[PDB]
Design a protein around this ligand. Structure first.
Ligand SMILES: Nc1ncnc2c1ncn2[C@@H]1O[C@H](COP(=O)(O)OP(=O)(O)O)[C@@H](O)[C@H]1O
Ligand SMILES: Nc1ncnc2c1ncn2[C@@H]1O[C@H](COP(=O)(O)OP(=O)(O)O)[C@@H](O)[C@H]1O
Ligand SMILES: Cc1cn([C@H]2C[C@H](N=[N+]=[N-])[C@@H](COP(=O)(O)O)O2)c(=O)[nH]c1=O
Ligand SMILES: Cc1cn([C@H]2C[C@H](N=[N+]=[N-])[C@@H](COP(=O)(O)O)O2)c(=O)[nH]c1=O
Ligand SMILES: [Mg+2]
Ligand SMILES: [Mg+2]
Ligand SMILES: [Mg+2]
Lengths: 210, 210
């Protein structure tokens, strides 16, 4: 069975990741592919509720612990992800390990190396779209929500970390100009996605950061 | 303020860790030290209940996720541990990161390196007592409980991992002959502990595996 592609959407807050993830799954299915949507954090599981509570500022969680929970929340969906991809379903994922390193990496005294480790070995994405746009334009998209990390200084430090993670060519990173219109951004991501789906069927699923 | 020592007790199942941890805290306090007992997993927290449920076989948890939860369960007590040690309290801990690597490391395809990473940076123990005894003698101590990992093959593979972790001299490992009587083993551990308490007051608390 021809495997599906693992596609990840990354980017700062308000970059359009959730809107484009949804629209990408709808377009791929309308085009005859079997595609499904996933997101991280996956807030429906027991670890997911601890995470959701933390982000809603309803609870405080020690920073290394919260980093590890974000990773475990990915490992708990790995058996499903592998199962689906091997069945031929392409998965479109709104945030993944990159967000996990970039957001904890924005906290002082958290090295990029330490942050990466828990995620070493996850399914390696076939494509990582980075939805680029000036944090200034992003701010034009209404106001900041009330969740943890939803402020300018934190976003700025996470973008810097994302810039470090892009210097790793082992991954198929693709920059997307997220400043355009929802439909324009969508057309770009769809075209990149169709190309990746075609090629993923040729090489086995690899492991991240290893 | 003269800091307290961080003492860890490690060893296989039924080696006497809980009995000796308790008795060690009682003896140190009777001898005029301020000492308190801790254990891992710490089953009282939200992560702790997920862990307890897993070990009671009431739930199944994906292996990398469960490994990370075991680590987070340590990081969530780090602010307390540091606070207490700096106040002059010696902490006696029944299991720590070593058990975290040795038990996950007993599962196929989990490298010692990957297992260590989440715990990199924890408070470094001043003393790590390893309660040594033949798995055969341990089995004489009644029967195996009904928790996960409580079987011969798994214990055997964890002991091998513990043997690897002892090859790291960066840590103050001390072997204890756990085959003796409860009081005899106790006298050995107490004497080693008093010596470590005296010296911890001279050097700052270090970080584990880094
Ligand atoms: N290309 C775009 N242009 C203008 N507004 C956009 C665009 N993409 C998304 N939006 C709006 O910006 C807000 C954030 O979009 P969303 O997809 O939720 O971003 P993310 O998931 O990156 O936080 C939403 O109100 C959305 O409608
Ligand atoms: N030195 C010893 N000799 C004989 N029995 C012992 C000794 N130490 C502990 N025991 C008994 O063995 C069992 C396991 O001891 P415990 O301290 O709970 O071990 P652990 O916490 O390593 O599993 C308990 O019933 C305990 O009373
Ligand atoms: C997947 C993931 C998300 N995050 C963050 C990014 C987001 N905060 N901001 N900005 C937050 C919520 O994600 P969404 O914006 O996709 O709902 O979780 C982490 O901190 N670690 C992780 O592993
Ligand atoms: C602290 C710790 C314990 N463990 C295990 C060792 C034990 N199973 N066995 N044998 C189990 C319960 O610990 P106690 O035996 O101390 O109750 O948790 C891990 O698997 N990872 C960890 O990080
Ligand atoms: Mg979103
Ligand atoms: Mg015990
Ligand atoms: Mg390394």
């Amino acid at each position: 069975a021809r495997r599906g592609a693992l596609i990840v959407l990354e980017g700062v807050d308000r970059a359009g990741k959730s809107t484009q993830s949804r629209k990408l799954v709808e377009a791929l299915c309308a085009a005859g592919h079997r595609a499904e949507l996933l997101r991280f954090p996956e807030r429906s599981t027991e670890i997911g509720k601890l995470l959701s509570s933390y982000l809603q500022k309803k609870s405080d969680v020690e920073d290394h612990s919260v980093h590890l929970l974000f990773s475990a929340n990915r490992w708990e969906q790995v058996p499903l992800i592998k199962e689906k991809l091997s069945q031929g379903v392409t998965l479109v994922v709104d945030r993944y390990a990159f967000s996990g390193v970039a957001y904890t990496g924005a906290k002082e005294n958290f090295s990029l190396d330490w942050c990466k480790q828990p995620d070493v070995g996850l399914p390696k994405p076939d494509l990582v779209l980075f939805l680029q746009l000036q944090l200034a334009d992003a701010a034009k998209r209404g106001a900041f929500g009330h969740e943890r990390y939803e402020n300018g200084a934190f976003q700025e430090r996470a973008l810097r970390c994302f810039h470090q993670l892009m210097k790793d060519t082992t991954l198929n990173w693709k920059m997307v100009d997220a400043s355009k219109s929802i439909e324009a951004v969508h057309e770009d991501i769809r075209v990149l996605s169709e190309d990746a789906i075609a090629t993923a069927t040729e090489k086995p699923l690899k492991e991240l950061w290893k």
